[PDB]
Amino acid sequence: TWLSDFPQAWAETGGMGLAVRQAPLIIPLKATSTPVSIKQYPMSQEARLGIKPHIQRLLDQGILVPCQSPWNTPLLPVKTNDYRPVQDLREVNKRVEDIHPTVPNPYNLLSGLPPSHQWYTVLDLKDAFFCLRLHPTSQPLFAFEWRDPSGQLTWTRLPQGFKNSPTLFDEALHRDLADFRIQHPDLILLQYVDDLLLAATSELDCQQGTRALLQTLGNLGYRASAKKAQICQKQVKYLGYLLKEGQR
Amino acid sequence: TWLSDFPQAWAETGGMGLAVRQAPLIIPLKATSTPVSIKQYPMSQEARLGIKPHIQRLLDQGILVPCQSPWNTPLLPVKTNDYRPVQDLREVNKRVEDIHPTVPNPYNLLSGLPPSHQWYTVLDLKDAFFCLRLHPTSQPLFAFEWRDPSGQLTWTRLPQGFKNSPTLFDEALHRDLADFRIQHPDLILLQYVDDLLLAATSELDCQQGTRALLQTLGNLGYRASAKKAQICQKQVKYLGYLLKEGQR
DNA sequence: CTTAGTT
DNA sequence: TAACTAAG
DNA sequence: CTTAGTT
DNA sequence: TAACTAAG
Ligand SMILES: [Co+3]
Ligand SMILES: [Co+3]
């Protein structure tokens, strides 16, 4: 009943997330930056047809909305022999002011894992970035032209490929789990963007903790993949390392 | 009468030099080195004809002599639209043990020039290397095949292109002028392989010094170019620098 | 002649 | 990874 | 589509 | 100074 007991925590049975606690972000520009409008490349009818179902959803979910901006970047058809929209935000990235990296690199992250905690739970957050709202004055930065034969659509949430997206989500989630960290000082919580690791002393403290977290997460607005989940094992796969009794 | 007063000091009127004080050198090998015999490349009759007059002289002067060695390197025709023998000692160089560089680089050499000494004399030594005898056990290293349609000829003096030749001549001449340096402490003598610089306080001390040196050199066995000579000036050309009142 | 070393 | 030079 | 960066 | 890749 791991799934039944926490409906709002899993993407499979929680719909879509929304970090309600987090104010919509602004994307500060470089003092030199001016809009760039890149024309849309043509696109096979098949490609454009495989991309419509995504543009349709995110439009109903209010993640995409129409707009009218001087910023415009191209959209892409990419093949898993299926299609999925991919925006080319490289020219926008060049113009966005950089932020200080806070995401610790995986090695130093795992350093702070006491060997005493041998009961692991691993969760990846589903559509992590969309959980973070964009402030309207920043939304025009990622507009893109769309048409199924027109005009511009942009994002209302932190988008795929925005160079600062992983750092910003990290700062957001660390903020939002600050409480949890305090409510459960016997547990060890590891944070790398969207991938989490919870380690405990006993299989008791692990399950009880995995519930406290899965509840904390659903309420706060994020969603985890019930598929790729790994609940209360002594052996889990976190950020490419294998964890078997404290090794790797 | 600069020329008349010192016949044995100038190559023009002193024939050929011979550092009589210096024992014939040995060329120590690398512990790994074994002879290499490189076959002679063909050679236009014109080239070979322009090279015969040199091979003829150095044979009469006893600088070249016949021999029979496992070492053999190629001889070269080079164009000044005239010919002059040039040996390719590169493969022998690879096999000769290196020696510690003692030749100071020109910058640091000129550093020790007191501005008080503004009266210069500059001399280049003619056929410097041939003034140094080779020990017979080392001579076979630079053999080369010669024929005016055969067999090997080698050198009895330090040869053109031997990688250690300039350092060895420097050590030799510094040795041989150690006395002079002491006999004339008011003069400044500068040594770079074959190019010398003598600087003095007065034009008196310069001329008197240039005589003491030109005599010291002739007796010891070296010869200077009376052509390219520069005697008692306040402005001379030494190792590419211009010396005008202590500048450069 | 070959070749050590160069955007 | 495409010759080109100066030097023996 | 483009393009940052690689013996 | 000859493309070739992965990534947006
Ligand atoms: Co160059
Ligand atoms: Co690679």
Query: Closest nt to A90 (CA→C1')?
Result: F8
Structure determination method: X-ray
The β-bridge relationship of strands A144-145 and A152-155 is antiparallel
Q: What is the DSSP letter of A130?
A: G
A161 strand F contact, CB < 7 Å: yes
**Distance in angstroms (rounded) separating the CA atoms of residues A229 and A12:** 12
Distance of CA A90 from the midpoint of ligand 2 (Å)? 21
Q: The sheet that has A152-155: what strands, in order across it?
A: A64-66, A152-155, A144-145
The Cα A177–Cα A196 span in angstroms is: 11
Q: Which nucleotide is nearest to B42 (CA to C1')?
A: C1
Q: Round and report the angstrom distance from CA (A90) to C1' (C7).
A: 30
Q: Which two three-digit tokens encode residue A186?
A: 């016997």
- Chain D positions with an atom below 7 A of a protein C-beta are 8
DSSP chain B: -TTTT-GGGBGGGT-----TTSPPB--PBPTT----BPPPPP--HHHHHHHHHHHHHHHHTTSEEE---S-B--EE---------EE-THHHHHHBPP-------HHHHHHT--TT--EEEEEEBTTTGGGSBBPTTTGGGG-EE------EEEESBPPTT-TTHHHHHHHHHHHHHHHHHHH-TTSEEEEETTEEEEEESSHHHHHHHHHHHHHHHHHHT--B-SSS-EEEESEEEETTEEEESS--
- Rounded to an integer, what distance in angstroms lies between the CA atom of residue A237 and that of residue A63? 31
**What 8-state DSSP symbol labels residue A112?**
T
Distance B47 CA to ligand 1 centre (A): 30
Residues 6+ apart with CB under 8 A from A92: A36, A71, A73, A141, A142, A162
Q: Is the dihedral of CA A162, A177, A227, A6 positive or negative?
A: negative
- B25 vs B32: CA distance, rounded Å: 21
Label residue A74 left, alpha or beta by phi (over 0 means left) and psi (-120 to 50 means alpha). Answer: beta
Chain C: positions less than 7 Å from a protein CB are 1, 3-4
Q: Strand E contacts (CB < 7 A) among A residues 17-46? A: 41
Q: Which residue is nearest to nucleotide E1 (CA to C1')?
A: A41
- A 69-128, residues with C-beta < 7 Å of strand E: 74, 76, 88, 90
Shortest CA to C1' contact from B86: nucleotide = D8
Q: Residue B75's closest CA among B112, B38, B106?
A: B38
The H or E element containing residue A205 is helix A203-220
Resolution of this structure in Å:
3.0
Residues A161-173 as b/e (b if ≥16 CB within 10 A, e otherwise) read ebebbbbbbbbbb
Which bases along strand E come within 7 Å of a protein CB atom? 1, 3-4
Cβ-proximal residues to B13 (8 Å cutoff; 6+ apart), any chain: B3, B7, B226
- Measured in degrees and rounded to the nearest 5, phi and psi for residue A220 equal -75, -25
